[PDB]
């Protein structure tokens, strides 16, 4: 009865320390009073959070910092680059050829090109889905990464550089005021004036959302375009079908 | 200017952690809520404080736990063991022989045995000083070490033993009440009912104090017993002296 005791005694420490082992892709700022160290740590969480949503919409598997390495490389122009081909275009690309190869004297000939044009028009919607996820969700946050975030990192880097310079200036008894003011104004701008990312998430969920209803209400029309075999080919003299 | 910065940068951590490196001679009790862990830590400080005053009166150098090792060994009976010989007995032991060897036809013959009997009667006072420091200051605290402190350590040892037993009894869902009551009554007895050591320090300072005035007022009598040479041998026809 002592093994299952000692088995839970050194496993509680392993279960308690299972958090601080991963989820790191950048450095850490210099350890300033709690009014400024809390703003600097909140800036570090704001940096890791603003640089950890854009890894999520392009690939479909993002549980790891490999998607953050995929996010750290960035692209501004879309020139000489087409859309990525999706599942519904390829779900109808063969079926067009299968419908013109199978046979026209059969009720599948009024049926396979209906599903083929259905998949080929969900193909343009999924071509739109990769564009509305990359133009209003990937683009302005990336331009804010290479915009004022370099200015914020520059002002806090010169803050942490010249803080030790004024430590040298004040500790010998007998560039930090203006730099700390611009840095603290940038930190209070990215904490208090945070009306930049509520709209980004609230428009990203609408940009994902307004494709699902369109392709659903287009796939509802396939039962109307395909409803002739429970009404006209149901009464066929060759075979009966499902009503 | 960066060396004296880094020199006073890594040295602040060494100056901040210069306390928790020594002053330990026993173990530590098991880490219970703050009402009981604070009483257990107060019991640990009460144990280290009650077992760290008796090291101080016998030896004259106690800055270290070597005096605590000298304090951990304890003695009850004083049988076939005389007093330790002190400085004033040995300050007059030769001077008796020097006075009976030097010469009686000289005013030092009325002077050296006066200082010799002075040092030989400070000798009995310092023989008394080792007894009043070992009988009312060393003895009852040592009898309290091997008295109810073993009972306190036994009740808190069975508390910390059967606390994990009732942890085993309560964590498996679907001897500690009475033991914790006797233990908590002993901890609240050694915190709240602490009218045991005010009298010990208040009598130890009187036991040290009432030797100093006795030997001072006895050494004041040496100027009266030795005042005949500024009055009778001052008017000697051989030589004059100091008045």
Swiss-Prot record, chains A, B:
Free-text description of this protein's post-translational modifications in UniProt: Phosphorylated at Thr-139 by CDK5; this phosphorylation is required for autophagy induction in starved neurons and facilitates homodimerization.
Q: Which GO terms describe its cellular component?
A: autophagosome membrane; cytoplasm; cytoplasmic vesicle; cytosol; Golgi membrane; membrane; midbody; mitochondrial outer membrane
Positions carrying Phosphothreonine are 139
Expression by tissue: Highly expressed in heart, skeletal muscle, kidney and placenta. Detected at lower levels in brain, colon, thymus, spleen, liver, small intestine, lung and peripheral blood leukocytes.
Answer whether the UniProt record assigns the keyword Thylakoid to this protein. no
Q: Which GO terms describe its molecular function?
A: cadherin binding; fatty acid binding; identical protein binding; lysophosphatidic acid acyltransferase activity; phosphatidylinositol 3-kinase activator activity; protein homodimerization activity
Give positions of region: Membrane-binding amphipathic helix: 1-26
Q: For the BAR domain, which residue ranges apply?
A: 23-235
UniProt keywords, alphabetically: Acetylation, Apoptosis, Autophagy, Coiled coil, Cytoplasm, Cytoplasmic vesicle, Golgi apparatus, Lipid-binding, Membrane, Mitochondrion, Mitochondrion outer membrane, Phosphoprotein, SH3 domain
Q: What is the effect of changing residue 139 to E?
A: Spontaneous dimerization
Q: Does the keyword Transport apply?
A: no
An example GO biological process term is:
membrane organization
Q: Where in the cell is it found?
A: Cytoplasm; Golgi apparatus membrane; Mitochondrion outer membrane; Cytoplasmic vesicle, Autophagosome membrane
The residue stretches assigned to a coiled coil in this entry are 149-174
In this chain, the stretch annotated as Required for membrane binding covers 1-31
Membrane topology type: Peripheral membrane protein
Q: What's the subunit arrangement here? A: Homodimer, and heterodimer with SH3GLB2. Binds BAX; induction of apoptosis augments BAX binding. Binds DNM1, HTT, AMPH, BIN1 and ARFGAP1. Interacts with UVRAG; UVRAG bridges the interaction to BECN1 indicative for an association with the PI3K complex II (PI3KC3-C2).
**Family stated for the protein in its record:** Belongs to the endophilin family.
What the entry says about domains is: An N-terminal amphipathic helix, the BAR domain and a second amphipathic helix inserted into helix 1 of the BAR domain (N-BAR domain) induce membrane curvature and bind curved membranes. The SH3 domain is required and sufficient for the interaction with UVRAG.
Miscellaneous = HeLa cells lacking SH3GLB1 show dissociation of outer and inner mitochondrial membrane as well as abnormal mitochondrial morphology. Cells overexpressing SH3GLB1 lacking an N-terminal amphipathic helix show a similar phenotype. SH3GLB1 binds liposomes and induces formation of tubules from liposomes. SH3GLB1 lacking the N-terminal amphipathic helix fails to induce liposome tubulation.
Q: What does this protein do?
A: May be required for normal outer mitochondrial membrane dynamics. Required for coatomer-mediated retrograde transport in certain cells. May recruit other proteins to membranes with high curvature. May promote membrane fusion. Involved in activation of caspase-dependent apoptosis by promoting BAX/BAK1 activation. Isoform 1 acts proapoptotic in fibroblasts. Involved in caspase-independent apoptosis during nutrition starvation and involved in the regulation of autophagy. Activates lipid kinase activity of PIK3C3 during autophagy probably by associating with the PI3K complex II (PI3KC3-C2).
User: By what name is this protein known?
Assistant: Endophilin-B1
Q: Which organism is it from?
A: Homo sapiens (Human)
Could you read off the lineage of the organism from its UniProt record? Eukaryota, Metazoa, Chordata, Craniata, Vertebrata
